[PDB]
Design a protein around this ligand. Structure first.
Ligand code: HEM
Ligand SMILES: [Ca+2]
Length: 400
């Protein structure tokens, strides 16, 4: 709950339907908020400038060991599995540097024609007369197929791969979500050992070959962790980019008709969807190495911090009229992909998938409409994520 003039629900009740008035309430009246979450307390930065500068704040680290007393941490491993997103320099830098050599913005762009055939394929298999769940049938699909094309997952293994991927996004997130984790992990290892014998154009083959101006390469353990990471960070988030962006246009006809007339605005549109309804609403947990101070509030060392990306993006100090959806905007400096050394590695691929999935969906089905009321929509009860479990839509006649 909120503590200001008017008390909004936080991470319960109405929050999950629409967290934005609660974010507006926090930015205004309680910008650095200690939340009594079930697991442990966590501080929430909602103001733009706070979040923006917290990302590049050295006193904020990804090492969870900062919560344990100084002597007790000289014993514990830093991370369970070597994913760079869990690491600080110089350990993160070494992995980021290597991945970046092969996972280039160029490869990200060269998938564009391939992505289109996935969307068009999926669109071609959707009935003129709905109702159809646009999430499970379309938005759930594009990000996982694209990731296969990037990694080079054999066409045979792709049904099995997407099957396990759905568990992570929308399923029984308890023990059943972790069952698919070990299955996807195992498959990718065996895949890497197959890629060693038979190489290809794909990124997994590319990553195996990457040395540097020191002869440093990715170890087996690091390779498969990276493969697993690209999947987790690149699936659910991009799904919800699609989910949220489609929903944004459906609820704003004025803007849907702007895009209809000028389909080149899609690139500008996807930018403002990431702002207007940030799919990753909360940044992965950070830790205080020492007393930081934001908007008057001093977070003591050893505390868990959370950066309100969704909140910081609708901040009026940064963005004029921050609650109005304008796809023609010239936005610059949103915190939806993050900031600093942890900036979204697949930022450009995400944008591509976004523009293709959304742009082609509307061009192919100009009569698209929600097949249920706005309030009937169920949103996932996830802390980090802002997105739908189901989105019933009526497709309409295909345009030829
Ligand atoms: C679809 C919209 C997406 C959003 C809103 C998003 C958001 C983010 C954010 C905020 C971070 C920084 C996390 C932090 O600093 O704690 C991040 C990191 C990352 N993302 Fe994305 N992401 C998206 C799509 C993707 C895609 C498609 C990929 C595929 C490669 C991807 C891969 C990664 C990776 C590998 C990192 C770790 C960066 C590092 O630690 O150096 N993301 N993402
Ligand atoms: Ca098989």
């Amino acid at each position: 709950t909120t503590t200001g003039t008017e008390q909004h629900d936080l991470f319960s009740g109405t929050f999950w339907q629409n967290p934005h008035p609660a974010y507006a309430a926090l930015r205004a009246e309680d910008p650095v908020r200690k939340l009594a979450l079930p697991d442990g307390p966590v501080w929430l930065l909602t103001r733009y400038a706070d979040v923006r500068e917290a990302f590049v704040d050295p006193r904020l680290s990804k090492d969870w060991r900062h919560t344990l007393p100084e002597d007790q941490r000289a014993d514990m491993p830093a991370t369970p599995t070597p994913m760079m997103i869990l690491m600080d320099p110089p350990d993160h830098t070494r992995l980021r540097k290597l991945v970046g050599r092969s996972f280039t913005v160029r490869r990200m762009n060269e998938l564009e024609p391939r992505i289109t055939e996935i969307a068009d394929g999926l669109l071609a298999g959707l009935p003129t007369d709905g109702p159809v769940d646009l999430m499970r049938e379309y938005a759930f699909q594009i990000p996982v197929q694209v990731i296969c094309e990037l990694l080079g997952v054999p066409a045979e293994d792709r049904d099995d791969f997407s099957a396990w991927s759905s568990v992570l996004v929308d399923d029984s997130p308890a023990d059943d979500k972790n069952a698919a984790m070990g299955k996807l992990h195992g498959y990718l290892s065996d895949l890497l050992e197959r890629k060693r014998t038979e190489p290809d154009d794909a990124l997994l083959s590319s990553l195996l070959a990457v040395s540097d101006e020191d002869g440093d390469r990715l170890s087996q353990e690091e390779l498969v962790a990276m493969a697993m990471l690209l999947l987790i960070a690149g699936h659910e988030t991009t799904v919800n980019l699609i989910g949220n962006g489609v929903l944004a246009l459906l609820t704003h006809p004025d803007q849907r008709k702007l895009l209809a007339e000028d389909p080149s605005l899609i690139s500008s549109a996807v930018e403002e969807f990431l702002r207007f309804d940030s799919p990753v609403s909360q940044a992965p947990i950070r830790f205080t190495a020492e007393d930081v101070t934001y908007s008057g509030v001093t977070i003591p060392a050893g505390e868990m911090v959370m950066l309100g990306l969704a909140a910081a993006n609708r901040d009026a100090d940064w963005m004029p009229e921050p609650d109005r959806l304008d796809i023609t905007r010239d936005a610059s400096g949103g915190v939806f992909f993050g900031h600093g050394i942890h900036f979204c590695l697949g930022a450009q691929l995400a944008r591509l998938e976004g523009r293709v999935a959304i742009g082609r969906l509307f061009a192919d089905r100009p009569e698209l409409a929600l097949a249920v009321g706005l309030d009937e929509l169920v949103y996932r009860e996830s802390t980090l994520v802002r997105g739908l479990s189901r989105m019933p839509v009526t497709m309409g006649p295909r345009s030829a």
